[PDB]
Amino acid sequence: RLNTLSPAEGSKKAGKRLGRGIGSGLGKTGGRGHKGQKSRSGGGVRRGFEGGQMPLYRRLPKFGFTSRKAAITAEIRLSDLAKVEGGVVDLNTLKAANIIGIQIEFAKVILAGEVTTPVTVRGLRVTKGARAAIEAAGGKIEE
């Protein structure tokens, strides 16, 4: 039955073929109008080009700096930490469970849903709401 298999309905859309005839809809100018820079092969202006007006990304001031330290902090939910294999949570025990990453040095145990088992959190910062949620479902937080 390889000549009876057939795709879904709506999955294979045709594909615009430009430049063929009058009936097709996209012939002569292929859908790109009359002359100009945009109807030209290769034609088009660059990104963030407003004619010559000073562009938006260049008339607005720049702010801030990049931390260096926010790239090594992480943010642990409570949906995990039932995933750590042990009921004890440090930076390793999270790295081992493929949940933070190897470069990570700091971690934090944000309330983002539903811890059940008694978990002993070690050496991680825990938010207020999630301290209450870990300690409410058995649990233990030392640091």
């Binding site: 990104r47 963030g48 990304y57 260049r58 607005l60 001031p61 720049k62 702010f63 801030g64």
Partner: peptide
């Protein structure tokens, strides 16, 4: 990335 735009807008 248009690099001087990353210094000016933040998502």
């Amino acid at each position: 990335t248009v690099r001087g735009a990353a210094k000016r807008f933040k998502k």
